[PDB]
Structure 1
Amino acid sequence: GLFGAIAGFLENGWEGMVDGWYGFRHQNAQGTGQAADYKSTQAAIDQITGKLNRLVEKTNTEFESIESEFSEIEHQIGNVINWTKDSITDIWTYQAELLVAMENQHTIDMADSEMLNLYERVRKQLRQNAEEDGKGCFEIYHACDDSCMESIRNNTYDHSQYREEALLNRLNIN
């Protein structure tokens, strides 16, 4: 899709992440872990919320009847009315069809977008201390324990703290 992450270079979703929309999985010496990212999940949710609010805002226009349910309508005027109403109906079913198709397109792509934006945020955090998988993972070239992992998700990772160790490992030297 538009941003290349969701249904893109990320091969699939995580059914086990019922905690949020986007998130992290890590692996170090202590083992594995999973945590949802709140900010990115919320940015997407609030946008969906916006569309639903627009969908559900109502117009104030009150209409009266121009067709009797119980007594006959004169034939010519009746034909005019049927023609007008069907023409109005076609317009509205066209518009409804378009609204959904267009909105769905935008919804799908903005969620891809928020996924990518999170990915980019982490990439720049780690700068020269990690390398990209190509599959949405970063290989970290230093000892990253559960607190270091947490500081990455929590946006407090200080790259300069590990840069020396990391660069030597990326160069494969001592």
Structure 2
Amino acid sequence: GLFGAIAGFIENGWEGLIDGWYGFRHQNAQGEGTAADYKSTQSAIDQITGKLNRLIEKTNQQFELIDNEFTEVEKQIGNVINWTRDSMTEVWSYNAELLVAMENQHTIDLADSEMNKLYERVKRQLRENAEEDGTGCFEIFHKCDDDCMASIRNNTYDHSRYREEAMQNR
């Protein structure tokens, strides 16, 4: 990914994360737990869905037969037809290849972007209360129970509540 999160500083994906694209995995006195983030997951889904809406569609132009499979047309005009058709085949094959390559590059970079955005959103939330690990983990200095972890996920987390304890723990 262009941003360097997916297949980047985040070592690998979670096969257990079946409910979402992106999620949180925590460690605290109470144990371990994993939860998907739907806002980031939905943003990625909506954008991929948009590409498919664009690519799966009508070319309303209807083309009639201009040659004949049973009784071949004159050879001069027939050769012009075939040359023109083969030229169009070449253009469209090239177009299709480039479209899919371009869209795939963007799709991968897009997913990588959404992962990065979620990470940075969390980093800003708990400023001066935690430090970046480098594996996509935040080491939190104060005690953070399941209600505290769920507040981070929820986005209600209040850093000023735990700042004195966390800051002083450095």
| Same-fold status (TM-score > 0.5) | yes
Letter in 2 for 1:113: S
Letter in 2 for 1:129: N
Aligned to 2:78: 78
Structure 1 segments unaligned to the other structure (5+ residues): none
Query: So what's the TM-score if we normalise by structure 1?
Result: 0.97
Aligned to 2:92: 92
Aligned to 2:129: 129
Q: How much identity, in percent, do the aligned residues show?
A: 79
Letter in 2 for 1:166: A
Mapped to 1, the partners of 2:72 and 2:13 lie a distance apart of 60
Letter in 2 for 1:24: F
Letter in 1 for 2:106: H
Displacement of 1:59: 1.7
What do the CA deviations read for 1:107-166 (whole angstroms, capped 9, x no partner)? 000000000000000000001100000110000010100000000000000000000000
Mapped to 1, the partners of 2:42 and 2:138 lie a distance apart of 24
Mapped to 1, the partners of 2:98 and 2:150 lie a distance apart of 44
What do the CA deviations read for 1:59-117 (whole angstroms, capped 9, x no partner)? 21011000112112100000000100000000000000000000000000000000000
Displacement of 1:58: 1.2
Aligned to 1:161: 161
Mapped to 2, the partners of 1:90 and 1:39 lie a distance apart of 42
Q: How many matched pairs?
A: 170
SS in 1 for 2:69: coil
SS in 1 for 2:34: strand
Structure 2 segments unaligned to the other structure (5+ residues): none
Aligned to 1:17: 17
Letter in 2 for 1:92: W
Mapped to 1, the partners of 2:72 and 2:122 lie a distance apart of 71
Displacement of 1:42: 0.5
Letter in 2 for 1:51: K
> How much is the aligned-residue C-alpha RMSD, in angstroms?
0.5
Query: So what's the TM-score if we normalise by structure 2?
Result: 0.99
Aligned to 2:2: 2
Aligned to 1:30: 30
Aligned to 1:56: 56
SS in 2 for 1:72: coil
SS in 1 for 2:126: helix
